Short mmCIF file of C-alpha atoms and ligand atoms in Angstrom, two decimals:
data_model
loop_
_atom_site.label_atom_id
_atom_site.label_comp_id
_atom_site.label_asym_id
_atom_site.label_seq_id
_atom_site.Cartn_x
_atom_site.Cartn_y
_atom_site.Cartn_z
CA UNK N 1 19.23 3.56 2.60
CA UNK N 2 17.58 1.19 -0.34
CA UNK N 3 14.69 -0.99 0.96
CA UNK N 4 14.13 -4.57 -1.11
CA UNK N 5 10.51 -5.72 -1.14
CA UNK N 6 11.21 -9.56 -0.46
CA UNK N 7 9.46 -9.15 2.95
CA UNK N 8 6.92 -6.07 4.68
CA UNK N 9 8.89 -2.62 4.75
CA UNK N 10 8.54 -1.81 8.39
CA UNK N 11 10.02 0.61 10.26
CA UNK N 12 10.04 2.39 13.82
CA UNK N 13 8.59 5.59 14.15
CA UNK N 14 8.23 8.19 16.98
CA UNK N 15 4.67 9.57 16.97
CA UNK N 16 3.27 11.33 20.03
CA UNK N 17 6.00 10.58 22.26
CA UNK N 18 5.82 6.59 21.69
CA UNK N 19 7.53 4.37 19.57
CA UNK N 20 5.78 1.94 16.67
CA UNK N 21 6.43 -0.18 13.98
CA UNK N 22 5.02 1.20 10.62
CA UNK N 23 4.91 -0.20 7.48
CA UNK N 24 5.74 2.04 4.36
CA UNK N 25 3.16 1.89 1.99
CA UNK N 26 3.26 3.73 -1.28
CA UNK N 27 -0.51 2.42 -2.15
CA UNK N 28 -1.84 4.60 0.81
CA UNK N 29 -2.85 8.57 0.33
CA UNK N 30 -2.60 9.12 3.84
CA UNK N 31 -1.47 7.68 6.97
CA UNK N 32 -3.36 5.80 9.70
CA UNK N 33 -1.99 4.54 12.96
CA UNK N 34 -3.71 2.29 15.65
CA UNK N 35 -5.68 4.06 18.53
CA UNK N 36 -3.42 6.25 20.42
CA UNK N 37 -4.14 9.94 21.69
CA UNK N 38 -2.41 13.04 19.54
CA UNK N 39 -2.89 16.62 20.59
CA UNK N 40 -4.64 19.53 18.93
CA UNK N 41 -7.94 19.73 16.97
CA UNK N 42 -9.42 16.64 14.92
CA UNK N 43 -12.03 15.99 12.67
CA UNK N 44 -14.05 12.36 11.89
CA UNK N 45 -13.27 11.18 8.48
CA UNK N 46 -14.06 7.68 6.43
CA UNK N 47 -11.27 5.84 4.79
CA UNK N 48 -11.84 2.33 3.24
CA UNK N 49 -9.69 0.14 0.95
CA UNK N 50 -10.21 -3.91 0.70
CA UNK N 51 -12.77 -4.99 3.39
CA UNK N 52 -14.60 -1.77 3.35
CA UNK N 53 -14.07 1.77 5.54
CA UNK N 54 -13.27 2.44 9.18
CA UNK N 55 -13.81 5.66 10.63
CA UNK N 56 -10.62 7.65 11.44
CA UNK N 57 -9.97 10.91 13.76
CA UNK N 58 -7.89 13.27 11.18
CA UNK N 59 -5.12 15.32 13.06
CA UNK N 60 -2.97 17.47 11.10
CA UNK N 61 0.61 18.71 11.73
CA UNK N 62 1.86 16.11 13.39
CA UNK N 63 5.50 15.41 13.53
CA UNK N 64 6.39 11.54 13.02
CA UNK N 65 10.44 10.90 13.35
CA UNK N 66 11.10 8.22 10.79
CA UNK N 67 14.88 6.93 10.33
CA UNK N 68 16.14 9.89 11.48
CA UNK N 69 14.30 12.15 9.56
CA UNK N 70 11.60 14.68 11.11
CA UNK N 71 8.68 15.27 9.02
CA UNK N 72 5.38 16.74 9.39
CA UNK N 73 1.81 15.43 8.23
CA UNK N 74 -1.36 14.15 8.71
CA UNK N 75 -2.39 11.62 10.36
CA UNK N 76 -5.48 9.09 10.93
CA UNK N 77 -5.94 7.29 14.22
CA UNK N 78 -8.78 4.36 13.98
CA UNK N 79 -9.31 0.61 13.96
CA UNK N 80 -6.65 0.08 11.37
CA UNK N 81 -4.94 -3.35 11.46
CA UNK N 82 -1.57 -2.15 10.42
CA UNK N 83 0.10 0.95 11.48
CA UNK N 84 0.80 2.44 7.82
CA UNK N 85 3.31 5.51 6.50
CA UNK N 86 1.66 6.61 3.63
CA UNK N 87 2.64 8.77 0.66
CA UNK N 88 1.80 12.44 2.78
CA UNK N 89 4.60 11.46 5.19
CA UNK N 90 6.82 9.74 2.36
CA UNK N 91 7.13 12.37 -0.12
CA UNK N 92 8.94 14.35 3.09
CA UNK N 93 11.78 12.13 3.84
CA UNK N 94 12.29 12.19 -0.20
CA UNK N 95 11.08 8.34 -0.64
CA UNK N 96 11.11 6.97 -4.07
CA UNK N 97 10.01 3.83 -5.78
CA UNK N 98 12.76 2.51 -8.23
CA UNK N 99 13.49 -0.03 -10.73
CA UNK S 1 12.76 4.71 -13.45
CA UNK S 2 12.42 6.91 -10.63
CA UNK S 3 8.82 7.48 -9.18
CA UNK S 4 8.01 10.12 -6.39
CA UNK S 5 5.22 9.74 -4.35
CA UNK S 6 3.43 13.58 -4.41
CA UNK S 7 0.54 11.50 -6.71
CA UNK S 8 -0.45 7.99 -6.95
CA UNK S 9 1.98 5.80 -8.25
CA UNK S 10 -0.05 4.40 -11.40
CA UNK S 11 1.39 2.88 -14.06
CA UNK S 12 0.01 0.68 -16.94
CA UNK S 13 -0.14 -3.03 -16.81
CA UNK S 14 -1.02 -6.01 -20.05
CA UNK S 15 -2.74 -8.77 -18.84
CA UNK S 16 -4.31 -11.31 -21.01
CA UNK S 17 -3.42 -8.88 -23.69
CA UNK S 18 -5.44 -6.27 -22.06
CA UNK S 19 -4.14 -2.60 -20.43
CA UNK S 20 -4.97 -1.61 -17.70
CA UNK S 21 -4.23 0.64 -14.58
CA UNK S 22 -2.84 -0.22 -11.71
CA UNK S 23 -1.18 1.41 -8.39
CA UNK S 24 2.32 0.79 -7.01
CA UNK S 25 1.45 -0.74 -3.78
CA UNK S 26 4.99 -1.80 -1.54
CA UNK S 27 2.24 -1.80 1.69
CA UNK S 28 0.48 -4.91 -0.05
CA UNK S 29 1.64 -8.37 0.03
CA UNK S 30 0.21 -10.17 -2.94
CA UNK S 31 -1.30 -8.22 -6.20
CA UNK S 32 -4.94 -8.12 -6.55
CA UNK S 33 -6.81 -6.76 -9.83
CA UNK S 34 -10.64 -5.96 -10.43
CA UNK S 35 -12.69 -8.45 -11.89
CA UNK S 36 -11.70 -10.06 -15.26
CA UNK S 37 -11.38 -13.72 -17.06
CA UNK S 38 -7.80 -15.68 -16.67
CA UNK S 39 -7.05 -18.84 -17.63
CA UNK S 40 -6.61 -22.15 -16.08
CA UNK S 41 -7.69 -23.40 -12.58
CA UNK S 42 -7.81 -21.04 -9.19
CA UNK S 43 -7.36 -21.70 -5.62
CA UNK S 44 -9.55 -20.04 -2.86
CA UNK S 45 -7.67 -17.14 -0.50
CA UNK S 46 -8.40 -14.66 1.87
CA UNK S 47 -7.01 -11.78 2.08
CA UNK S 48 -7.32 -8.63 4.91
CA UNK S 49 -7.24 -4.76 4.34
CA UNK S 50 -7.85 -2.24 5.88
CA UNK S 51 -11.96 -2.69 6.62
CA UNK S 52 -11.52 -6.34 6.77
CA UNK S 53 -11.47 -9.41 5.04
CA UNK S 54 -12.73 -10.89 1.63
CA UNK S 55 -12.88 -13.90 -0.67
CA UNK S 56 -10.56 -13.38 -3.78
CA UNK S 57 -9.75 -15.87 -6.75
CA UNK S 58 -5.95 -16.96 -6.76
CA UNK S 59 -4.26 -17.75 -10.05
CA UNK S 60 -0.75 -18.51 -10.16
CA UNK S 61 1.80 -18.26 -13.24
CA UNK S 62 0.04 -15.63 -14.61
CA UNK S 63 2.46 -13.94 -17.13
CA UNK S 64 1.59 -10.03 -16.89
CA UNK S 65 3.53 -6.89 -18.14
CA UNK S 66 4.21 -3.95 -15.39
CA UNK S 67 5.52 -0.65 -16.91
CA UNK S 68 6.85 -2.38 -19.82
CA UNK S 69 8.67 -5.09 -17.41
CA UNK S 70 7.70 -8.64 -17.60
CA UNK S 71 6.64 -10.56 -14.71
CA UNK S 72 5.07 -14.23 -14.05
CA UNK S 73 3.35 -14.70 -10.89
CA UNK S 74 0.54 -14.73 -8.92
CA UNK S 75 -2.75 -12.95 -9.72
CA UNK S 76 -5.59 -11.87 -6.88
CA UNK S 77 -8.79 -11.50 -8.64
CA UNK S 78 -11.62 -9.60 -6.22
CA UNK S 79 -13.24 -6.86 -5.26
CA UNK S 80 -10.41 -4.55 -4.94
CA UNK S 81 -11.02 -0.55 -5.02
CA UNK S 82 -8.40 -0.60 -7.84
CA UNK S 83 -5.41 -3.05 -9.25
CA UNK S 84 -2.79 -2.95 -7.01
CA UNK S 85 0.74 -4.24 -8.07
CA UNK S 86 2.14 -5.62 -5.05
CA UNK S 87 5.53 -6.90 -3.66
CA UNK S 88 5.34 -10.35 -4.85
CA UNK S 89 5.68 -8.97 -8.46
CA UNK S 90 7.62 -5.21 -7.77
CA UNK S 91 10.13 -8.14 -6.50
CA UNK S 92 10.21 -9.11 -10.11
CA UNK S 93 10.89 -6.26 -12.13
CA UNK S 94 13.65 -4.96 -9.16
CA UNK S 95 11.93 -2.09 -7.63
CA UNK S 96 12.95 -0.98 -4.01
CA UNK S 97 12.23 1.71 -1.90
CA UNK S 98 14.95 4.76 -1.63
CA UNK S 99 15.52 7.71 0.54
C1 017 K 1 -6.02 -0.93 -1.39
C2 017 K 1 -5.15 0.45 -1.53
C3 017 K 1 -5.75 1.00 -2.89
C4 017 K 1 -5.06 1.63 -0.09
N1 017 K 1 -4.57 0.37 0.95
C5 017 K 1 -3.14 0.68 1.44
C6 017 K 1 -2.43 -0.84 1.20
O1 017 K 1 -1.27 -0.70 0.83
C7 017 K 1 -2.85 -1.79 2.32
C8 017 K 1 -2.04 -1.86 3.68
C9 017 K 1 -2.72 -2.71 4.32
C10 017 K 1 -1.73 -4.03 5.34
C11 017 K 1 -1.95 -5.21 5.94
C12 017 K 1 -3.53 -4.42 6.75
C13 017 K 1 -4.32 -3.69 6.09
C14 017 K 1 -4.05 -2.72 5.30
N2 017 K 1 -2.76 -3.60 1.63
C15 017 K 1 -3.56 -4.38 1.51
O2 017 K 1 -4.71 -4.03 1.62
O3 017 K 1 -2.85 -5.62 1.05
C16 017 K 1 -3.96 -6.95 0.95
C17 017 K 1 -3.33 -7.69 -0.47
O4 017 K 1 -2.09 -8.16 -0.12
C18 017 K 1 -2.02 -8.37 1.30
O5 017 K 1 -0.89 -8.22 1.94
C19 017 K 1 -1.49 -7.15 3.07
C20 017 K 1 -2.65 -7.34 3.21
C21 017 K 1 -3.44 -7.94 1.86
S1 017 K 1 -5.73 1.02 2.42
O6 017 K 1 -5.37 0.06 4.04
O7 017 K 1 -7.06 0.31 2.22
C22 017 K 1 -5.75 2.93 2.80
C23 017 K 1 -6.44 3.44 2.49
C24 017 K 1 -6.63 5.01 2.87
C25 017 K 1 -5.56 5.21 3.52
N3 017 K 1 -5.57 6.32 4.13
C26 017 K 1 -4.26 4.53 4.08
C27 017 K 1 -4.31 2.86 3.51
CL1 CL K 2 -13.83 -19.66 -3.10
NA1 NA K 3 -3.32 19.95 14.28
#
């Protein structure tokens, strides 16, 4: 589909068996989701942006369903104010910016 | 242009006759640039990022070229990690997300 940017590009995704609203974010290197449990191993990481850094848990090889497409990637879990779908996952569904 | 997301979607922008590097960011509502001098009066604004809130200077109706595309709108100046071209200006240059 073609998403205009008049409003925040929010989409519904399926991760860890639950539905969540997320923001499609070309300005993000890695996906960040609010606190939730995920299977497998993880390692601590610090990610920063406007306002500073937050500590998150990094899980690799996680399956995320987005717009019918099933993509696999890294997911950071921590105290983020908004769920963000980053380039790490956007590349897998072939998302591109056009103008 | 059609920009893939395997690398950061960085472009060259021109503001105040100066060339700068900026990140095309669909996950941001307003455009934020690192400290620099802009004409006119500014208004206060607080924006919340991944690490919390910060105060910035809001300048309106600023002329800015983005990847060769002319735009005129609001530019926020503050301690951002990188210059970010957000939805307020992406909509002006006719940018959309596609997949
Ligand atoms: C600042 C950029 C270099 C990177 N940011 C992504 C960006 O899209 C965020 C994404 C975002 C969105 C909402 C809340 C927090 C973070 N937007 C943002 O800070 O925008 C602010 C300016 O306009 C406003 O509109 C949204 C809040 C304001 S980030 O949230 O810090 C980030 C950093 C690292 C990772 N892995 C994932 C995300
Ligand atoms: Cl102030
Ligand atoms: Na894993």
